Design a binder for this molecule. Structure first.
Ligand SMILES: O=C(O)c1ccc(C(=O)O)cc1
Length: 294
């Protein structure tokens, strides 16, 4: 078709939600006469761009590349959504990535223990950025507060990218971002990452310990980036698109870029993708209850 493939990322450009489909989009451009364009449609925790793709023609030329918010979390948190995430047509999972605790380095804090005490001394004073209500950074922050007894004031953003800008600029204190987008700044000293919310360390930040190592093993928060087609999209179209992307994800160049920012390439078929989204939808639903989020 002379039309381009429209991949909608419902978060600000500059974060992991943007860069992973963008890297893959470049590899699959030869598959489409009209090309492959990324469209950034941020706002409302990813629901604006999500609603946009949800209403798009089910022809497989408009798709949503999104982290879990609009995919597996928002419908169990928001009072009413204009779309039903259980009706997405799964294409594939691009990658899973662990979340980490990022702080502004100018805070008088160099460890988790110091941070917890620093927040407990003044409840509500320490501000925590999020990528929007229902994002994993939101639920990971709430998860953290439940386990530690700290009280952080949530500040939502249209994505990781504007949140990091403010964090580095001293306008927001902490951020439970995913490691991929924050590691770039940690190496340059622009931020300080205190811990990884995963069972193993990440090899891009070998010195940053897991929460579990720091004796907070209940801090387990791994996000994932999915590709979904509008409701009604045929299984053939979704499968042909997942194969195109699975081919991209298997190349050395993409594996290298993914590996180097701590992203784990997946590329599963739509059926395994569908199961995984069910498993994750259930996982985060329990986090919603256990930390009662809002
Ligand atoms: O919900 C998440 O985990 C998530 C949200 C936004 C972004 C981004 O703005 O790149 C990345 C991850």
């Amino acid at each position: 078709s002379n039309q381009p493939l429209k991949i909608v990322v419902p978060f600000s450009a500059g974060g992991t939600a943007d860069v992973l489909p963008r890297l893959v989009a470049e590899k699959i451009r030869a598959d489409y006469a009209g090309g492959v364009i990324i469209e950034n449609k941020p706002g409302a925790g990813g629901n604006i761009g999500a609603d946009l793709v949800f209403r798009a023609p089910p022809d497989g030329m408009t798709v949503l590349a999104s982290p879990p918010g609009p995919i597996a979390i928002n419908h169990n948190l928001y009072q009413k959504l204009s779309f039903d995430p259980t009706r997405w047509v799964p294409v594939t999972i691009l990658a899973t990535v662990p979340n980490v605790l990022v702080i502004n380095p100018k805070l008088p804090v160099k460890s988790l223990g110091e941070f917890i005490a620093y927040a407990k001394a003044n409840p509500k004073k320490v501000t925590v950025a999020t990528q929007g209500d229902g994002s994993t950074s939101h639920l990971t922050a709430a998860m953290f507060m439940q386990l530690t007894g700290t009280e952080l004031t949530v500040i939502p953003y249209k994505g990781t990218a504007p949140a990091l800008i403010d964090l580095i600029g001293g306008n927001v204190d902490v951020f439970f971002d995913n490691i991929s987008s924050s590691a770039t700044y940690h190496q340059a000293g622009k931020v300080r990452i205190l811990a990884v919310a995963d069972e193993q360390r990440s090899q891009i930040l070998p010195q940053v310990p897991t929460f579990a190592e720091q004796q907070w093993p209940a801090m387990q928060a791994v996000t994932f980036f999915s590709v979904v087609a509008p409701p009604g999209t045929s299984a053939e179209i979704a499968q042909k698109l997942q194969k195109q992307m699975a081919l991209a994800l298997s190349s050395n160049d993409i594996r290298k870029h993914f590996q180097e920012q701590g992203a784990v390439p997946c590329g599963w078929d739509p059926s395994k993708t569908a199961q995984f989204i069910r498993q994750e939808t259930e996982k985060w639903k329990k986090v919603l209850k256990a930390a009662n989020v809002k």
